[PDB]
Amino acid sequence: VTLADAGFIKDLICAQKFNGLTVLPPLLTDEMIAQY
Amino acid sequence: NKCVNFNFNGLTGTGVLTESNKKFLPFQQFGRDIADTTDAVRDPQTLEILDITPCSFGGVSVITPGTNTSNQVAVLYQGVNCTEVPVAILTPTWRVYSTGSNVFQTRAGCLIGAEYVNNSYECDIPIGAGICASYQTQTKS
Amino acid sequence: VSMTKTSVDCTMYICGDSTECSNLLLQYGSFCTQLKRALTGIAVEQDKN
Amino acid sequence: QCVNLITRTQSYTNSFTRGVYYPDKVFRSSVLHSTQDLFLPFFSNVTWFHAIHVSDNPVLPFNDGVYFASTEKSNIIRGWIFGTTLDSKTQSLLIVNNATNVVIKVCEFQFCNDPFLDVYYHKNNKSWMESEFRVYSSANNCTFEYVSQPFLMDLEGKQGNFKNLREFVFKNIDGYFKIYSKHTPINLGRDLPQGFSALEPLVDLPIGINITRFQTLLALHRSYGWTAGAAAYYVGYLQPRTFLLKYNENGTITDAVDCAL
Amino acid sequence: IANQFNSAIGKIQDSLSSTASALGKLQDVVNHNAQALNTLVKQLSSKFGAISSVLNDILSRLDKVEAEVQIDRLITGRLQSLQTYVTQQLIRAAEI
Amino acid sequence: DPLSETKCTLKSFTVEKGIYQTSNFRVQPTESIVRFPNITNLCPFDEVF
Numbered sequence: 001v002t003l004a005d006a007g008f009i010k011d012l013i014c015a016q017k018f019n020g021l022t023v024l025p026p027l028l029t030d031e032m033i034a035q036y
Numbered sequence: 037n038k039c040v041n042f043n044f045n046g047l048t049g050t051g052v053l054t055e056s057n058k059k060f061l062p063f064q065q066f067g068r069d070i071a072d073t074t075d076a077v078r079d080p081q082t083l084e085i086l087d088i089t090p091c092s093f094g095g096v097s098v099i100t101p102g103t104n105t106s107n108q109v110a111v112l113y114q115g116v117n118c119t120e121v122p123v124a125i126l127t128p129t130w131r132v133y134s135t136g137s138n139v140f141q142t143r144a145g146c147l148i149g150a151e152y153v154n155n156s157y158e159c160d161i162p163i164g165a166g167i168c169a170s171y172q173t174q175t176k177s
Numbered sequence: 178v179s180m181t182k183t184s185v186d187c188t189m190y191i192c193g194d195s196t197e198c199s200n201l202l203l204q205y206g207s208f209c210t211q212l213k214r215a216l217t218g219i220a221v222e223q224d225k226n
Numbered sequence: 227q228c229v230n231l232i233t234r235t236q237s238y239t240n241s242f243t244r245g246v247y248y249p250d251k252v253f254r255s256s257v258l259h260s261t262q263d264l265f266l267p268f269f270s271n272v273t274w275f276h277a278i279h280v281s282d283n284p285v286l287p288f289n290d291g292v293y294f295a296s297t298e299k300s301n302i303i304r305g306w307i308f309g310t311t312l313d314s315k316t317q318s319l320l321i322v323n324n325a326t327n328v329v330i331k332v333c334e335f336q337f338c339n340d341p342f343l344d345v346y347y348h349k350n351n352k353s354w355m356e357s358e359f360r361v362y363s364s365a366n367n368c369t370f371e372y373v374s375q376p377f378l379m380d381l382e383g384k385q386g387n388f389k390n391l392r393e394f395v396f397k398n399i400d401g402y403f404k405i406y407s408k409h410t411p412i413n414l415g416r417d418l419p420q421g422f423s424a425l426e427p428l429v430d431l432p433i434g435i436n437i438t439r440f441q442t443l444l445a446l447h448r449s450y451g452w453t454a455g456a457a458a459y460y461v462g463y464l465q466p467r468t469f470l471l472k473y474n475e476n477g478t479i480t481d482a483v484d485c486a487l
Numbered sequence: 488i489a490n491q492f493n494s495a496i497g498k499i500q501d502s503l504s505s506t507a508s509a510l511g512k513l514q515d516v517v518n519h520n521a522q523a524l525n526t527l528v529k530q531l532s533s534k535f536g537a538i539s540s541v542l543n544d545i546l547s548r549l550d551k552v553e554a555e556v557q558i559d560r561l562i563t564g565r566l567q568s569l570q571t572y573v574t575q576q577l578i579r580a581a582e583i
Numbered sequence: 584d585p586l587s588e589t590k591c592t593l594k595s596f597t598v599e600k601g602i603y604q605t606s607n608f609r610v611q612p613t614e615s616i617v618r619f620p621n622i623t624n625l626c627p628f629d630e631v632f
């Protein structure tokens with residue numbers, strides 16, 4: 001499964017941001033989900 | 037390499053201008069991204085191609101507990117490089133948090149006014165990307 | 178189990194670097210707070226799920 | 227000078243993928259872009275004219291743009307008339323080109339009936355040039371004159387039977403007249419070859435007048451006396467049409483879908 | 488029983504590796520999040536009955552009275568594109 | 584100050600424990616620049632002046 005945007009610190013990903021649309025990171029990282 | 041207002045041949049906008057690895061055709065003047073938004077413009081006088089990206093921006097989340105409990109707060113500049121909020125010495129008129137020694141790059145954004153501690157706890161206030169914040173006294177040493 | 182958290186803002190989406198439109202948009206009242214709140218209500222729920 | 231001696235015969239052939247052109251002056255990379263504009267459809271039935279001289283030449287319609295193609299050596303094809311009346315009752319646009327410079331000139335021209343051009347050897351100037359313009363009586367008032375490099379060139383050297391096909395799209399809109407073109411080499415395979423190539427905008431001219439009809443100029447050398455010759459060209463007409471256009475990493479239109487084929 | 492289990496776990500890897508569509512229900516969510524933001528950012532280029540979708544084009548070419556109503560159309564249209572996106576998101580959040 | 588801004592965006596003198604999105608930050612231009620081609624085609628008004 002490919003992820004379009006991770007939402008991490010800064011393509012269509014850029015242009016979305018250019019117009020104020022932002023992607024927020026999940027609280028639990030993929031390491032914390034692997035630990036659970 | 038400086039955030040500026042621009043007008044090329046009547047193509048008006050705002051952003052940082054940077055040299056481009058894109059190679060336009062001789063008759064083309066500007067490039068549109070997948071979102072059909074302008075992201076390059078060819079200088080009319082000397083025909084080099086410049087990338088445009090908007091000047092930096094982001095959300096500003098304030099981490100405040102019960103007003104009754106305390107009046108001090110941290111601020112998270114969302115998706116922002118924590119070297120760039122200092123260069124952004126703007127919409128938030130409160131300049132003071134440009135000069136903070138207690139400054140931290142979370143993956144979620146630049147967090148200012150809260151200090152990183154190596155010890156871990158249950159998540160009191162969520163910041164994002166594994167990070168949480170809390171109002172308490174540490175006293176380890 | 179979850180979907181991408183998103184946030185947006187009328188100030189930039191409807192008109193970036195545009196004070197004139199920013200003043201016209203005030204005439205429409207609370208809709209932008211409703212939209213921002215609704216997307217924040219989705220975003221906090223993705224962590225909960 | 228009103229010599230009605232040129233004539234032309236006609237037939238039909240298939241314009242497979244030809245007559246696609248860059249719709250705006252914009253770069254795009256690896257992106258599929260859709261637009262509604264005057265385009266020539268895929269596998270459109272395209273008229274095939276042969277023009278000849280014997281020692282009968284009807285003026286052509288123009289509406290919603292024309293595609294014109296040809297592939298003659300020595301650049302015997304030399305220009306066009308575009309215009310409302312072509313008789314000095316309303317102004318009209320003349321294109322003529324030679325080996326070193328094209329003129330774009332729009333005036334109240336009385337063209338007589340059939341306009342051709344007459345480059346011949348003059349003994350006293352020891353060289354080739356146009357004798358007298360049989361194209362028209364006289365120009366009365368002119369309001370725009372432009373000069374530039376010949377919109378058409380031959381390939382370097384000359385390979386045997388190796389024609390280049392020359393393509394033009396002519397549009398009139400909002401006062402402007404827009405030329406698009408491409409010059410593609412031909413393995414000497416077939417007419418309008420299989421493959422793809424999009425026309426670049428050559429000139430984009432604020433003529434400002436009204437176009438309803440068009441015609442083309444052929445040269446004659448006057449060797450002693452109008453030595454007889456032949457030429458070919460193809461005419462297609464544009465429609466208000468939707469296209470999906472594919473840009474490569476370099477922002478050339480590499481392929482297209484005709485949206486109602 | 489252990490060999491049946493161990494050989495069954497061996498087939499999960501090959502199934503997931505070979506099958507293009509196996510994570511379809513997760514890819515679909517990622518694609519709908521990407522398509523919804525692409526559609527929302529594309530909707531900025533729509534005219535909504537105005538002379539142009541470019542705001543400073545309007546402000547340059549038209550006077551304060553006329554320019555304002557042209558922007559209004561763009562405000563009303565864009566604000567519709569946001570309410571649509573947020574309603575689609577609130578419905579899509581409920582099935583997640 | 585940023586607490587005074589959260590009190591304002593929540594329309595209340597007492598904000599509770601949490602994280603609150605306030606006004607978006609955005610760096611304004613340092614100046615404005617005009618780019619148009621070389622000044623070709625000067626009008627032949629001089630030949631008559």
Ligand SMILES: *[C@@H]1O[C@H](CO)[C@@H](O[C@@H]2O[C@H](CO)[C@@H](O[C@H]3O[C@H](CO)[C@@H](O)[C@H](O)[C@@H]3O)[C@H](O)[C@H]2NC(C)=O)[C@H](O)[C@H]1NC(C)=O
Pocket residue numbers: 323324325326327329354355373
């Ligand atoms: C191809 O056709 C061209 C136009 O028919 C022709 O250009 C013409 O060139 C002559 C001489 O170079 C010009 O004559 C005038 O030149 C200057 C221009 O200011 C004057 O000072 C001179 O006194 C003289 O009047 C023509 O004006 C010019 N035509 C146009 C429309 O600009 C080319 O020479 C032709 N080329 C060949 C190979 O035949």
Ligand SMILES: *[C@@H]1O[C@H](CO)[C@@H](O[C@@H]2O[C@H](CO)[C@@H](O[C@H]3O[C@H](CO)[C@@H](O)[C@H](O)[C@@H]3O)[C@H](O)[C@H]2NC(C)=O)[C@H](O)[C@H]1NC(C)=O
Pocket residue numbers: 474475476
């Ligand atoms: C986009 O433009 C690119 C730059 O012009 C172009 O790259 C070029 O590709 C051709 C064809 O592969 C190369 O031609 C050959 O050159 C020598 C042999 O003469 C070989 O060593 C090369 O590998 C190659 O086969 C050009 O050298 C190459 N130019 C550059 C500067 O890299 C792309 O092909 C263009 N892309 C499309 C889709 O048209």
Ligand SMILES: *[C@@H]1O[C@H](CO)[C@@H](O[C@@H]2O[C@H](CO)[C@@H](O)[C@H](O)[C@H]2NC(C)=O)[C@H](O)[C@H]1NC(C)=O
Pocket residue numbers: 009010116117118119120141
């Ligand atoms: C934030 O920006 C700084 C620069 O202000 C980045 O630091 C650069 O990192 C790259 C990659 O390691 C180096 O090649 C550069 O030399 C660094 N520049 C400077 C001036 O130190 C940093 O990587 C960025 N990081 C984040 C989290 O956004």
Ligand SMILES: *[C@@H]1O[C@H](CO)[C@@H](O[C@@H]2O[C@H](CO)[C@@H](O)[C@H](O)[C@H]2NC(C)=O)[C@H](O)[C@H]1NC(C)=O
Pocket residue numbers: 366367
């Ligand atoms: C173009 O030139 C012709 C010829 O000089 C002009 O025609 C004259 O126009 C005037 C004004 O309408 C009439 O009174 C004359 O009877 C016309 N004479 C002829 C012979 O046509 C014409 O007006 C000029 N056009 C422009 C735009 O200057």
Ligand SMILES: *[C@@H]1O[C@H](CO)[C@@H](O[C@@H]2O[C@H](CO)[C@@H](O)[C@H](O)[C@H]2NC(C)=O)[C@H](O)[C@H]1NC(C)=O
Pocket residue numbers: 310436437
């Ligand atoms: C170009 O010329 C044609 C022909 O004169 C114009 O068509 C006329 O348009 C008027 C106004 O609609 C009608 O009353 C006439 O009956 C039309 N004439 C013919 C013969 O169809 C056309 O309007 C002109 N175009 C422009 C842009 O001026």
Ligand SMILES: *[C@@H]1O[C@H](CO)[C@@H](O)[C@H](O)[C@H]1NC(C)=O
Pocket residue numbers: 080081082621
């Ligand atoms: C414009 O002038 C500059 C400076 O002389 C020159 O470098 C440039 O090539 C000119 N423009 C074009 C299109 O040649």
Ligand SMILES: *[C@@H]1O[C@H](CO)[C@@H](O)[C@H](O)[C@H]1NC(C)=O
Pocket residue numbers: 102104105
């Ligand atoms: C705030 O703190 C006061 C004591 O300083 C307490 O009486 C009050 O109940 C608190 N309010 C809330 C909402 O917790």
Ligand SMILES: *[C@@H]1O[C@H](CO)[C@@H](O)[C@H](O)[C@H]1NC(C)=O
Pocket residue numbers: 152153154
């Ligand atoms: C955490 O421990 C490292 C040493 O392992 C130390 O260098 C670092 O300063 C500590 N963290 C903070 C934020 O002080």
Ligand SMILES: *[C@@H]1O[C@H](CO)[C@@H](O)[C@H](O)[C@H]1NC(C)=O
Pocket residue numbers: 238271
């Ligand atoms: C093209 O049109 C002409 C006249 O409309 C017709 O005679 C001819 O058959 C058509 N072409 C083909 C391949 O049918």
